[PDB]
User: What shape does this take?
Amino acid sequence: KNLQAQNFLTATQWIGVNTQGSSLKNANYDLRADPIIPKADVGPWMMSSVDPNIYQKPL
Amino acid sequence: QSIGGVTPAGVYLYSFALKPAGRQPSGTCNFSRIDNATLSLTYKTCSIDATSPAAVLGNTETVTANTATLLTALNIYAKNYNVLRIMSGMGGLAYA
Amino acid sequence: AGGLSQLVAYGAQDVYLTGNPQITFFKTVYRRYTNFAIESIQQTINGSVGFGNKVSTQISRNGDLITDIVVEFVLTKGGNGGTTYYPAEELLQDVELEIGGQRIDKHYNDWFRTYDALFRMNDDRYNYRRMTDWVNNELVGAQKRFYVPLIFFFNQTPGLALPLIALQYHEVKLYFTLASQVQGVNYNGSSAIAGAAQPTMSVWVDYIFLDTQERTRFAQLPHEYLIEQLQFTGSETATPSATTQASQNIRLNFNHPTKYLAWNFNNPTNYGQYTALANIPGACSGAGTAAATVTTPDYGNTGTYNEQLAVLDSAKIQLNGQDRFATRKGSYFNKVQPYQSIGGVTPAGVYLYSFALKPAGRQPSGTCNFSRIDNATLSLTYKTCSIDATSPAAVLGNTETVTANTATLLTALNIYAKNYNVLRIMSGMGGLAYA
Amino acid sequence: GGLSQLVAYGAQDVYLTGNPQITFFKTVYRRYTNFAIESIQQTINGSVGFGNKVSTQISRNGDLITDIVVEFVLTKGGNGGTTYYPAEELLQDVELEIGGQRIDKHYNDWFRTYDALFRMNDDRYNYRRMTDWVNNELVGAQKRFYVPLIFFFNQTPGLALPLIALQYHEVKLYFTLASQVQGVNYNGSSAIAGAAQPTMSVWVDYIFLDTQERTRFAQLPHEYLIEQLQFTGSETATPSATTQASQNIRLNFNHPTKYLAWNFNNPTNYGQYTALANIPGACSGAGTAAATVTTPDYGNTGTYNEQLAVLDSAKIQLNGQDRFATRKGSYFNKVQPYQSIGGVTPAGVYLYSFALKPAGRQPSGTCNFSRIDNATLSLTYKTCSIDATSPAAVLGNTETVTANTATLLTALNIYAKNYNVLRIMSGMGGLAYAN
Amino acid sequence: VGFGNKVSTQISRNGDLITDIVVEFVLTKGGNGGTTYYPAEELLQDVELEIGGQRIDKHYNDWFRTYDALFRMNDDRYNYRRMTDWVNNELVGAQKRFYVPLIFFFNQTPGLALPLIALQYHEVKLYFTLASQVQGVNYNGSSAIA
Amino acid sequence: EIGGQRIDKHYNDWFRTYDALFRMNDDRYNYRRMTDWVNNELVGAQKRFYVPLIFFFNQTPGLALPLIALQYHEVKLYFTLASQVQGVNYNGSSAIA
Amino acid sequence: INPNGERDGTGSYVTENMCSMTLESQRGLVNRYITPPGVTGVVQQGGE
Assistant: This one.
């Protein structure tokens, strides 16, 4: 039959994974890849969540 | 023989069961084991002038109304047994 | 809320209905049964079919057990609607059941009428009428096939089906007597109807075909069946009159455990007439108009519930001189007895007294064994025949103890007794335990 | 032939005939204790007549008792069409007492309601024949009526009251006769000059047991599951011609209840459960110029036309919680009895069953009202805006309206039938539960 | 809901077993007494019983008439007629609530009450086809009733 | 209805009684704006009304129904619409054609 | 009162039979009537 009221539901693979995130607020527009620098939170105040935006498929 | 009520003219019954009106099986004809089952019907002569009561009310066994030819449809029904199986919270018939 | 609120409202007074429950109503388990089939076979009628003739048939060895018997007749109307009354029933004057050359039972046209009057009802009775009469205002020359079912013990239930294959040396026969006259078919009152056709007759028997194991058991095993028989004699009815309440003591020549007695008074001229004729609607030919004549019934309405036309005032049954019950009025035997024990509605002029809780059922439910009574007597008091039947004021405004002057025409008395006996079948032969 | 059916055996038949358990061709009848039934007249203490109240003590003239019939002899105070079940109307009520304790009680209206719901077909017609004049009898006509009692022991042998086991308690029936009976001593509000007083007789059918059963009944304790009637008469919110009257009735009932039943009526006219109207049968002279919608056609007081019924809708509520969804009055008049009884119920008479088969003896489901703190019946009436004297309005109207004459249906009778235990021991007995 | 339409219902889990099913209809008279014949029965052209998507059974308006003709009787039959027709000489414009009992196996006996409680994983539905025309209600023979 | 059990039931009159008694100030006014015409609208005017329900779970998140914890029980709302509404399809006892 | 798990419920067709049907249907058989070899344009007939 079935297993009802006690099943491992879907957590994040329901609406689909986010292939964008916050990686496009300060996105790159040039065709060439950009020099990637890590996040490395150095600010006591005024941080960000820019998400590095590493070009996985370069020119 | 089989029910005990009164059936109106034009409606017919043939039982394969001692008491077809009940729930409990009392003899059945299993048509899943019969290839060619046929109902053979002979009709009455439609020669009575229906607009003349004498023609109708005073006529013979095998003769009916000219208006009887309007009874062009035949509905044949049969009632059988099957088994409804329920388990695992689901169910359906034993025979498809 | 809803039904659940009822279930939870449980306490001490529920214990006697639902505590330690034994059953449910929601889980029917059906019984598995032996395999069998039912087939209709036409029998050969020996002798010559016609009015007044005697014919017979041997029930053919076309099955293992037999039940229903239906006698078909093709009759025509010798007059218009209203001139016939259950003519197929009237025609089958009698039927005798013979096994191994000996009598088992015998029914009469009048018995069929009496039986019906007491035991059939509602739409069964109507459908029955449809199989023996013309009930749709048919006219002269009309032709219909009638079906007269028989009511021998094996014709009422498969439980008493007769194991014909067990009777290796004995045949089962039906002897039939056809009436010399049938009202509205070949005679109209006392007159013959010129040109009337002779009946066409056919006898049908329903055979039970059993599977192998069951067939073997029936052929090999001895059997006993508790079956019904009808005892019957005709008597002269004491004649009542305008000047008197006739009385009569009829010694009952009966035997065996009897479920019930049944009787009627009648006019031999008019089949089914158990009541007086009168000029009130349905009570005579032409009733309600100038032609109303209280010498002939409205045949199509021969039977009636109008007690005032009944002839019996009161009655009692004595056993060896001891009243078996306190005297009751004729209307008690007509209306109440069947109310309490049958549940149908009995026509005036037909009476029943039961010794059984269920006179209509198969299962014995108390019987009077007449074989142990030296002098059983039916004591009848008749109504005074003083009412002028041609005057509705007199016919309808009268008293309990009187009836129509025309009630004196009900000169015949038919007394029946329904008893049990034991059918015995062994070593290829039929049988009856008691005489 | 039938052989062609027997050979047609497959896997699907295993459920019906495999490993067979039963046959249909071998009825086994159960041997039973020998017994006999005797009909014995009881004496009556006190004169009978209109407005009289009398009683009987059931004589010790048998071991067990069942059927009881009260006979009356009435004379018509007018012509056919002036009476309606007058013997039923006359017997205002019957009270059953054992050892000085009330066991049960029936009312004339209950007999009418009971009949309207539970009797049927020819059982009902034969019943009517035992309580009324149904063959167009005329003024002065004399007739003996037979009105049966319907106490638990009067319906089945299974509940025969063991008088022999009640050696130290008297068993009595108190019978109240109506002050007036329509068409017999009164015609609407007027008395009928010269009307005769009724003759009365009470008959009890006694069971005579054989030696061993008599001893057991006399010595052993017994518990008989019995039915009891509960009845509360009350004010009906007077129906209105301008709006929908409504009413909340306290269902002051107790015990496991098989069913509730009720009707609305006009107390002036016995059996009137519907409005009067100028349509054939719906009022005195209905259909013609002389018609009045102030008086019923007494002989046709009852009707199946719910257009003349007052109830629009109803629900039963227990402890402030609906027991079922609100249904229309026609649901309680026609569907309920279709489902639960199988007969036809006259307009104005309603049923709500808690049982699968309320018409039977087996307690096939019950509602325990002795476990409810606040039981109530909520009724809504139709708008009584239809001009009763105009067939076009009477017959062409809507589902939610009725006759203006429906405002006369101001009395409501609510009945309940429940199950209790009548315990007999050491010669004495009474009910197991007071409430 | 309307003439000629196909409608359905799903049976709610408001109890454990089910038996009787009655379909209530309200019809009006499009002509005088004598113009209709069991019109609520005619209206229910057909009905189907389905469990988990499997048709268990089906009845037709004609079947209801045939069934009745053979198996109902006496006052059972009359009361039935009262719940499906106009039998008290009602006139044109009359409105009436009719009750059509169904005749599926579980609608005839408690012995076969459908165990909805045991069908926790399957839906149970009824389908009903309403007639395009009902005599004396929306059409007099072939003539539409305005 | 939850699990087939009747949990609660409200009536048009309750909505009116409840509002009349428990809502207030601009909560009541804004509430009226969602159920009536309050800007002197004229015949033929069409508006969408929003009638919030007032069951316990419709008043606080604290009693939100855990449909997630009721995987085997469905939750239903059964509604009845009035046969007549004043100033919409009827004017007192008269119908508005 | 009553569970309702008919939402996530499979159809009833999963619980059928497919082998307790009607008769065996002896209509579909093999073809075992091979026509004569004869002659044709390729294999012409021999001389008289």
Summary: Chain B touches chain D at residues 16, 18, 25-34, 81-83, 94-95 (CB under 8 Å).
